[PDB]
Each structure stands twice: as C-alpha cells, then as structure tokens.
C-alpha cells in the first residue's frame, strides 16, 4: 500500500544512494585528530545509545547523530574534553530533525552530568549547523534496512530486529566501518540476520534493487561477522543490553553463526 510508497520507492532509493556518497564522513579522519581516538569515539557512541534508551528516541535519531559527529570530526579538530559536547549537540540536532517530541535542551544539559552549560550546548548546536551547512537529511543504515525488509518472504521480526542490532553495532567502531557506505552495511546486516535466523541468503530481488551481490558484500560481511562473534567481549555493551528488550525481540541473545559458508 501507500505506506510503502510504490510510486516513489525506486526514486527514493536511487536518491539515497546518491546522497550517502555526498554525506559520507572522511574515512581517515581519526589519524588526523591529535587528541581523540577510535576508542574515545566508541565510548561516545555507546553513551549516545544509552541516551537514546533513556529518552526513548528513535533508532534513526541515533544513526543521524553519529553521521553528524563523524562529518563534524572530518573537518574539525576536537579536544577529548569537548568530544561529548559535540556528541550532545549532534543528538540535540538529530532529535529536532527526526523526533515528534524531542527532549528539551535542559534534558540534554542534564545527561552530560553538568559537564557543560546550556550556553555551551546551544553554541555548539550553532557551530555544528555551520560546519555541516545545515545539511542534516543524511541517509542512514536504517533507511536502507527498512526498504530491504520489504523483500522478505515472509516478514520475520527476529530478522528485522537482528539486522538493526548488527547495523547499530557498526556505529561503535570507526575502524573498520567508516570505510563502508550505509547501503552496504545495511545489506551485509540484512544478509547476516537472514542467515542467522532462517538459513536463507541475500535474495535475487535485492540484487535487482541494489546491484549488490554476496561477492561485492563479502568484505563488509567478513567484518560484520567478526564484530557479531566478538560482541559479548567488546568494551562497549549498551547495544547488546538494549537489544535484550522485547521491543527488539531479544535478538542480542541469539547466537551468531560459526561460519558464513560464502
């Protein structure tokens, strides 16, 4: 039906494929940051997951915020004591763009444990907007996933929730996932979820839609499979905790496959 916009689906997918390239963060930016590391970024993104949980934000909002952060850090050097300010402002902006009822600015001041003032959060909001030139309508892993889900025969909630879980795990680790586009991470996450739950693979209908095949997805899939296998041992755990919830069908309790047999 119209909720799946049959007359525009293909146009939209094509437009998102153009925009994701335009909205892509610079892959090698962390090496150019003198004061911050992949580990510090991981801690930040894990905190943002907890924030999204506390205020019951859309997963889309979280994905947008990470996009804004990585793009901001692609051109702006930030000291370690200011990274959380960038993150808080990014999440505020993401909420304003995406949420029906975004949290108040004071609620964003509060969740930083008063590390920052309202004045600082608002000034950072302005700076982020300037650096990003107000270009906030960025494609996310989730915007591709929800389209890919329409290709299931039939729809399976465990598959959908598991794919979201995997896409979210990829947000934490700039190495390797900065090198992959959202549409590609989404494709690998969807295949890996489908395989884990049903034993089935990336369908021919999605090859038709995306031009991606298992061969072209292999690099990301190998990375994602390893992340999935290592998830219980990762220093950051907020996504696994989050995905134990019935809201996401407890999918983080599912066991990853030992091999992919590609």
């Amino acid at each position: 039906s119209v909720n799946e916009v049959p007359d525009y689906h293909e146009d939209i997918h094509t437009y998102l494929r153009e925009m994701e390239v335009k909205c892509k963060p610079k892959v090698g930016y962390m090496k150019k940051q003198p004061d911050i590391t992949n580990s510090m970024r991981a801690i930040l993104v894990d905190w943002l997951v907890e924030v999204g949980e506390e205020y019951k934000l859309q997963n889309e909002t979280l994905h947008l915020a990470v996009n804004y952060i990585d793009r901001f850090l692609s051109s702006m050097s930030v000291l370690r004591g200011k990274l959380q300010l960038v993150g808080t402002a990014a999440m505020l902006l993401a909420s304003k763009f995406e949420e029906i009822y975004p949290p108040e600015v004071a609620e964003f001041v509060y969740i930083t444990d008063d590390t920052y003032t309202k004045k600082q959060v608002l000034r950072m909001e302005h700076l982020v907007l300037k650096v990003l030139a107000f270009d906030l309508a960025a494609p996310t892993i989730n915007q591709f996933l929800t389209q890919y889900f329409l290709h299931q025969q039939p729809a399976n909630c465990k598959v959908e929730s598991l794919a979201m879980f995997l896409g979210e795990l990829s947000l934490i680790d700039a190495d390797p996932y900065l090198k992959y586009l959202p549409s590609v991470i989404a494709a690998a996450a969807f295949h890996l979820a489908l395989y884990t739950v049903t034993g089935q693979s990336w369908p021919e209908s999605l090859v038709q839609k995306t031009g991606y095949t298992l061969e072209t997805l292999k690099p990301c899939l190998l990375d994602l499979h390893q992340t999935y296998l290592r998830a219980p041992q990762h220093a950051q755990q907020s996504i696994r905790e989050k995905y134990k919830n019935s809201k996401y069908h407890g999918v983080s309790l599912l066991n990853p496959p030992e091999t992919l047999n590609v």
Binding site: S1, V2, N3, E4, V5, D7, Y8, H9, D11, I12, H13, Y15, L16, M19, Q58, E60, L92, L93, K96, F97, I100, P102, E104, V105, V121, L122, E125, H126, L129, K130, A133, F134, D135, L136, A137, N142, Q143, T146, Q147, L150
Partner: protein, 298 residues
C-alpha cells in the same frame, strides 16, 4: 555572505515562523524574500532545521528556491527567490471572472510536478493550502513554506499527528491512522483544485468532526467496500451518520468530464487507491496544458 548587500523594501508576509520581507540585492539587482527566524530558549527551531535542510536538497522549478542562509548569533535569515503573490490572494482578485481554465490547468500541472519531485526525494509537505502556493508574473506557481515538512522513510513510520491545515487535511489523519503517507499531500491538492474552480474552500470545517462530516456529506460516508479497514480506524465511530455519495458532477458543477475524473481520483478515500502526483501528470485532463501568464496584474 551576506546581509550588507540587501536593501529591505517592505514587509510581505508573516507566520510563526516568522516575518517575510521583500529585499533587493544592491549589487546584482536580484529581488528576494527574506524569511527572518528569531532565535532563542531552545536554540534553532526544528521547523527551521527541517525547512533549510530539505529546501537545500530540493531544486525544482515548482519549488521555492532557497538562495542562501544568513546564520548569526541572534538571527537566522533564509534568502528565497521573490514571488509576486500567493494563490489565495489571486483567487480573491479573480472574483467576477474566475480563473481561466488554461491557468487552473497549468497551475495544477505545475503543483503536481513540484509535489512529485518532493515525494521522489522522500519529503512530505504537510501544509499545502493556497496561502503556501506562490505565483509569479511569468505563469509559474511554486510550493513554499517547508517548515511543516518531513523527510520520510520507506515504509513510513508514525509521524506528528497534527498535521495539515484543517480545511486541507486528509480523512486518514482525521481518523487517526497510525501511518499516513504521500497521499495526504494529494488530498490537499485535490481540495486546492476544487478551490481554483469555485474560488471557495471545498471542505471549510471548524473542528475535526465538522471537517469529517463535511467530507462525508460530499463524498459519502466511507464503508468497508470503499475503504477497507475504515471501521477499524482509531477515531472511526459506528455512530457516524451514513451520508450517500453525491453525484460527482454536483461537487464542482463547472468542471468537465476529464477534470471530474482527476478530482475524483485525488479525493479517493482509500490512501492506497488515491492517485499519485506522478501518475496524475499523465491524466487526460492535461492533454492540452500550456503555461500562460496570469490574466491579472500581480
């Protein structure tokens, strides 16, 4: 830039937003509209964030052009192309003669082009009403004011329930559907099509229930045959009166067979069956469409 290059001419609009000025670029001569957005105690308004991000992406002849953003400590100015009038004022000026058919047809065709472009770029407008449709002296009409717009995903999620100015608001919003989609903007354009022909609002309700009852009196109270699932909608009531559907030629009597056909497809109850902007462009109503200038001085 900018700013020191603009000479303000006069106030031309207001909203909340929001005030709009006509200005001229002192160096290039370009005439612009300056939409001023006042800042602060929650920082930059989500309506401004959405309008700017979306309008920056949307470059189309039938979509108002955002030229620049002047972003400073206390003020935000959006610099737009200037247009001479809105469709509501034009309808008012066209009392006694009406709007010539070739112009109604040209305007609808252009509105559909602008809308199909939004929908193809995953944007819902959500406030299509004559006041937000701007016209120039060369015969263009353009969608404006994207403060109420939203970038959607596929399939859609639940978005703000408001939404859309009451007279132009689709029955699926009025009945509280969990999901609404591109069809809501087509409903509004259907209302505007009728309004261009008659110069009066098709469904001028004063509350949500009155709005619904006015729609039902015109198009019939919808049942499970016309609109599968309607009786199960959150705000549907089995006690709704059951009005018969009118002879559709009585809704807008001066409209021809092809016009009536298109209007009926834009006002289809079932959002799944309602015509898309993209499909409407190929409707036989537009077989002889041209783009004449407005018949009146703006």
């Amino acid at each position: 830039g900018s700013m020191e290059n603009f000479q303000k001419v006069e106030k031309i609009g207001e909203g909340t937003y929001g005030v709009v000025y006509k200005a001229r670029n002192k160096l290039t001569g370009e005439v612009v509209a300056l939409k001023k957005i006042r800042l602060d105690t929650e920082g930059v308004p989500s309506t401004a964030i959405r309008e700017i991000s979306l309008l920056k992406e949307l470059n189309h002849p039938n979509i108002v052009k955002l030229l620049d953003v002047i972003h400073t400590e206390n003020k935000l100015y959006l610099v737009f192309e200037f247009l001479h009038q809105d469709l509501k004022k034009f309808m008012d000026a066209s009392a006694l003669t009406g709007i010539p058919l070739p112009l109604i047809k040209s305007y609808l065709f252009q509105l559909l082009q602008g809308l199909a472009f939004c929908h193809s770029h995953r944007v819902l407008h959500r406030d299509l009403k004559p006041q937000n449709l701007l016209i120039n002296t060369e015969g263009a009409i353009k969608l404006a004011d994207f403060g109420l717009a939203r970038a959607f995903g596929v399939p859609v999620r639940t978005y703000t329930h408001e939404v859309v100015t009451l007279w132009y608001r689709a029955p699926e919003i009025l009945l509280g559907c969990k999901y609404y989609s591109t069809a809501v903007d087509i409903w509004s354009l259907g209302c505007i099509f009728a309004e261009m022909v008659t110069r009066r609002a098709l469904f001028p309700g004063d509350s949500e229930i009155d709005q619904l009852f006015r729609i039902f009196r015109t198009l019939g109270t919808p049942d499970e045959v016309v609109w599968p699932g309607v009786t199960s909608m959150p705000d549907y009531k089995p006690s709704f009166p059951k009005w018969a559907r009118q002879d559709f030629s009585k809704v807008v009597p001066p409209l021809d067979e092809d016009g009536r056909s298109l209007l009926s497809q834009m006002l289809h109850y079932d959002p799944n069956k309602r015509i898309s902007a993209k499909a409407a462009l190929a409707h036989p109503f537009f077989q002889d469409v041209t783009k004449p200038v407005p018949h009146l001085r703006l």
